[PDB]
């Protein structure tokens, strides 16, 4: 089906506690495959998925150089942003950047992404045309002008349409037994009396990959959006994810409720009920 590659950079200043930390992690879909941390005893790009290990020393050296250079550049950028906002040298600040490429089920480039945030607020983003910028404010307008002057968009576009897709396609082939395998959720409904006249029905989805899933409750075939407690999808630690949806129902009315489950790994969408 569809696939993406993303790198996520986080650069965090910490005045009085050394120079800003730079961390980079790389993902294919919901699978992390590399990390780099400037605070590590000996900072180097390290593998985080078995299928990347087969890459040669040149790969690791090249990546490590890129991230070491980025460490320095992001420190400059933090200094620069502090200035753009007239901020004190006393506070900690964070730049985040995410970029990468999306492929459709045919392996074609669907779109590219390059987005940044400052202190968790959108700062600047490469537009879907991979040619123009959206700046959030007059500070980001300075970065925009700087990047417009240095032809940054053209460089990001070439990567996103080229290297990004080429390496994503390589990784997808090298890791095809996991990356191109959808594990369906194992699903069940639990029942927990809350009082004499109400009970919680909880619909569980366990052991699925990728993370994308839809879990809903219906009452008489109508969605219970407002009355459903839906927890955030959470990692199990073995690559898979877990989720549940719960509804409080009148005692005796349990069979009017249906849990509906959609996920890529399923031969067909599931309808479950509580089974006493």
């Amino acid at each position: 089906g569809s696939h993406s590659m993303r790198y996520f950079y986080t650069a965090m200043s910490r005045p009085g506690r050394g120079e800003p930390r730079f961390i980079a992690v790389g993902y294919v879909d919901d699978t992390q495959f590399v990390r780099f941390d400037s605070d590590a005893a000996s900072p180097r790009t390290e593998p985080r998925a078995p299928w990347i290990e087969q890459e040669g020393p040149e790969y690791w050296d090249r990546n490590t150089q890129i991230f070491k250079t980025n460490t320095q550049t992001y420190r400059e950028s933090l200094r620069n942003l502090r200035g753009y906002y007239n901020q004190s040298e006393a506070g900690s600040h964070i730049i985040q950047r995410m970029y990468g490429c999306d492929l459709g089920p045919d392996g074609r480039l669907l779109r590219g992404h390059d987005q940044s945030a400052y202190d968790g607020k959108d700062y600047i983003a490469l537009n879907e045309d991979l040619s123009s910028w959206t700046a959030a404010d007059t500070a980001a307008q300075i970065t925009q002008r700087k990047w417009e002057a240095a032809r940054v968009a053209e460089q990001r576009r070439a990567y996103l349409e080229g290297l990004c897709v080429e390496w994503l396609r390589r990784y997808l082939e090298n890791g095809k037994e996991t990356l191109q395998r959808a594990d369906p959720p194992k699903t069940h409904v639990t029942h927990h009396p809350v009082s004499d006249h109400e009970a919680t029905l909880r619909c569980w989805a366990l052991g699925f990959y990728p993370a994308e899933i839809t879990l809903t409750w219906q009452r008489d075939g109508e969605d219970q959006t407002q009355d459903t407690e839906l927890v955030e999808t959470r990692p199990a630690g073995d690559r898979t994810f877990q989720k549940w949806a719960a509804v409080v129902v009148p005692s005796g009315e349990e069979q009017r409720y249906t849990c509906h489950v959609q996920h890529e790994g399923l031969p067909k969408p599931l309808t479950l009920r509580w089974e006493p």
Binding site: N63, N80, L81, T143, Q155, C164
Partner: peptide
Amino acid sequence: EPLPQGQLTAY
């Protein structure tokens, strides 16, 4: 594979 160092443009 990440985006090449290129020219490193700082923000």
